[PDB]
Design an enzyme around this catalytic site. Sequence first.
Site, mmCIF file in Angstrom:
data_model
loop_
_atom_site.group_PDB
_atom_site.id
_atom_site.type_symbol
_atom_site.label_atom_id
_atom_site.label_comp_id
_atom_site.label_asym_id
_atom_site.label_seq_id
_atom_site.Cartn_x
_atom_site.Cartn_y
_atom_site.Cartn_z
ATOM 1 N N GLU A 61 -5.446 11.501 -12.148
ATOM 2 C CA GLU A 61 -4.555 10.574 -11.471
ATOM 3 C C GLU A 61 -5.276 9.289 -11.120
ATOM 4 O O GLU A 61 -4.634 8.253 -10.938
ATOM 5 C CB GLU A 61 -3.959 11.211 -10.216
ATOM 6 C CG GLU A 61 -4.930 11.631 -9.130
ATOM 7 C CD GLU A 61 -5.227 10.570 -8.099
ATOM 8 O OE1 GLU A 61 -4.435 9.614 -7.970
ATOM 9 O OE2 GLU A 61 -6.243 10.723 -7.392
ATOM 10 N N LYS A 70 8.306 -6.878 12.477
ATOM 11 C CA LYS A 70 9.184 -5.728 12.301
ATOM 12 C C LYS A 70 9.141 -4.805 13.512
ATOM 13 O O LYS A 70 10.185 -4.485 14.082
ATOM 14 C CB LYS A 70 8.820 -4.933 11.040
ATOM 15 C CG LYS A 70 9.120 -5.617 9.714
ATOM 16 C CD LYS A 70 8.368 -4.930 8.578
ATOM 17 C CE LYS A 70 8.887 -5.340 7.202
ATOM 18 N NZ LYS A 70 10.272 -4.845 6.943
#
EC number: 3.4.24.56
Length: 948
Positions: free
Chosen positions: A65, A852
């Site tokens: 990976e 945010k």
Amino acid sequence: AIKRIGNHITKSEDKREYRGLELANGIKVLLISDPTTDKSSAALDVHIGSLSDPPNIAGLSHFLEHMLFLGTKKYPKENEYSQFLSEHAGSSNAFTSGEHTNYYFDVSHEHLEGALDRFAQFFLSPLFDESAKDREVNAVDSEHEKNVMNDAWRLFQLEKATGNPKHPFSKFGTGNKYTLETRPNQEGIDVRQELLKFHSAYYSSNLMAVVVLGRESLDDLTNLVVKLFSEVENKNVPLPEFPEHPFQEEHLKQLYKIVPIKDIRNLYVTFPIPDLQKYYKSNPGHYLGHLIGHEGPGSLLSELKSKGWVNTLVGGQKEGARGFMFFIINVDLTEEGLLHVEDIILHMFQYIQKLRAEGPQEWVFQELKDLNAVAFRFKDKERPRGYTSKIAGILHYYPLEEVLTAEYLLEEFRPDLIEMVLDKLRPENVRVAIVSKSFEGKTDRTEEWYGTQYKQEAIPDEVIKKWQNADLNGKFKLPTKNEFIPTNFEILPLEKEATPYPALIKDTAMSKLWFKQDDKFFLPKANLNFEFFSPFAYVDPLHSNMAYLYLELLKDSLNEYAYAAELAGLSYDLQNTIYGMYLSVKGYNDKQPILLKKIIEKMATFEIDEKRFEIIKEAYMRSLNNFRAEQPHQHAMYYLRLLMTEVAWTKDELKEALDDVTLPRLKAFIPQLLSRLHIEALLHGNITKQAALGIMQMVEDTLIEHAHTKPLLPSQLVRYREVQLPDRGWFVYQQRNEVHNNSGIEIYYQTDMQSTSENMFLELFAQIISEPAFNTLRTKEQLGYIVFSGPRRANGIQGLRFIIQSEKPPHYLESRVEAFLITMEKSIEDMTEEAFQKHIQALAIRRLDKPKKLSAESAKYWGEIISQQYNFDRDNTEVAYLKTLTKEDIIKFYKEMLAVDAPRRHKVSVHVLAREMSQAPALPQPEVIQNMTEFKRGLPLFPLVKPH
């Protein structure tokens, strides 16, 4: 495998439209639609981990990976994907677990099609190139190498390692270069043909989990990606499960005595337990974690504090494998807490017996159900990085409407589960682990990879027999019902006073108070950042030592009360600064003046216990000489804030000054400290202006009530100055670490105060030195791993620093730093108008973003209030200045300030030696620095800043 399914998703306050589906080749799909989000994203999670590796080669899926990044049939170039996310500000990363490997990335605004085009065909054509392999083996070895001495992963792997050698749990996750590439070729095994084997056989089948944070709609992104994902082909690999816990009675009812790296003392209690993942509706594990690690009257922790044996703890349900799961209890130790462990275990068994008497409780279940009811209902927003990967981690077990009500909603009460885990939690199921440094000459079984040493030595039967039968109650009680539960859910309508920034609504000679309320965010929460200010804080080592021990025993006393608030979402923090002591409360809108009243009145009139004082003294005294042992980048940043202030106490002198600290001296000191002081506070959230005035009045009146605090005069509003450099000098010196075999460096540059020109100058220079330094020095030249570059902003002063820990000669390293400076110097004049425009626009979007989370913007504003700047409309300022820059200006920035032939040269580096100790010109000679005090003796000091 183009299949599509969607409907209403229970999504709490949020405006982000959602859908979930699953493609017939075993791919979980979440569709996110939001028309107001800038950054779009996607993240694939494979439900295959690194415990599914072949038994001979470790970290094979880990390495694949890694290798699955680089190289496609459509774009066989190496960093092509990554460089395409270097064009549009994206940042991919991936991680690996026992059963999962989870890729994730983002993208600038709408550019998804590109990255997804460069992401989908990973499954068709992996390449396994020369450069990918030959650099990634070094990246895996450094990835393990930073995890060599990291004690969390160390003790983690020691839990991973002391089990069944037959269970596939016994795989080594990351793998160093010895197991990665040295192990197959010394066995003659081709790494790449295995890679092709592993990719072909395992990956392609099922169990993917994609999400797509897109900002278009649902349907257009839907029929894009269903169409775009039919090339993944199902293979029907079965679901990997373990039908037993790895501790098949060879390893049960066992102790261990472990020697750590950092000098810590911990005691570890572990239960391997079967899965209750099907019981996500009732979730006894939240009840167990809620009930075990509770801190109240008649609690276990109350007794352990009351005997003074355990400082703090954390325990609870540990997630594990598909079949088995874990249950931990991790406690801190004192001296005879190290010596009288068995009785602690007895007290644990008394607490277990307390759980055996009342059995389960329902009002607790309703109470926790209401807490998760409200708290799941009132969810704010999500992080575009990390959230999607987290949910996609938990996406494996739930349908597309249950993706949000994941474990954060509980339907039913199942006392049979509580009977099961009560029946499970027995002295039969206990795993024990003792952590102490003093076990030398006594531990034979050495770790193979890392090298810690331990011993089995199973507990004899006399202690066991006494453990099962003697489970009774002493002074232990059930934890009282919470009262800090809110009924304040009322959104306050914004007033006529429509200011976008906090106004000084109250001014005294005592305080100064700033306040805003959220027009956007709309939550029943609030922030509180009280700062005590005092001359006497940093005057000497001695009173500072008393301040730290004071605040330590302060929180330690008020903890047992504090736990119910902390469990409810009501946080606080007592801290000390160079200025004074630092308070930061954050949480809900319920008992805000009330709890604050209690806090202020408690630390106003506060008392001391004797042996408590002995424990705080001894324990932080043990915590002192650990600061020899940290990494030199941290140690060097300590020296950076050491050199670049006015006064600074080193940790040795501060360490030695506790040899004479007795309790009556402190207790005399305390009200004298509390006699005069200043508070300046930022309050932000769901309250009003007049109630804020009452809260402030409340506080200061409480102070005048207790210790008769009087206001300050504005001549003792001092700040610390910063050291002038003699306009052409390049100064440096070195320290030496004992443990690490690495040298560190930090390379400071005094530009200037934050004037309007200097902000955009240094920011622009910082971004232009951001990516090419990462590209050529750390990546291409392979200098080290702790390579860091960039700005420094402290005390209203800009700065430029370069933090590099490696195994090199530091002057050699300097030479290549300067070589990189020449490289950048030449790289200046090579800038076109595209680099220019994309670079300044990426700088703009790096700087410009609307907040945010409310806690974030409060930390930024707070960070500006402590710096006394207050210019909140610096953004318009910076953007308006930004349009007026050229490239020749940055040569004008470069020459007198940054180049080597500089009349205005303000250069300074810091060396940190290792344990045992391609062309550069001749730079001028440095100075030796014996006495830092005699250095700073005749040196000027900087002005301070006019506050906006």
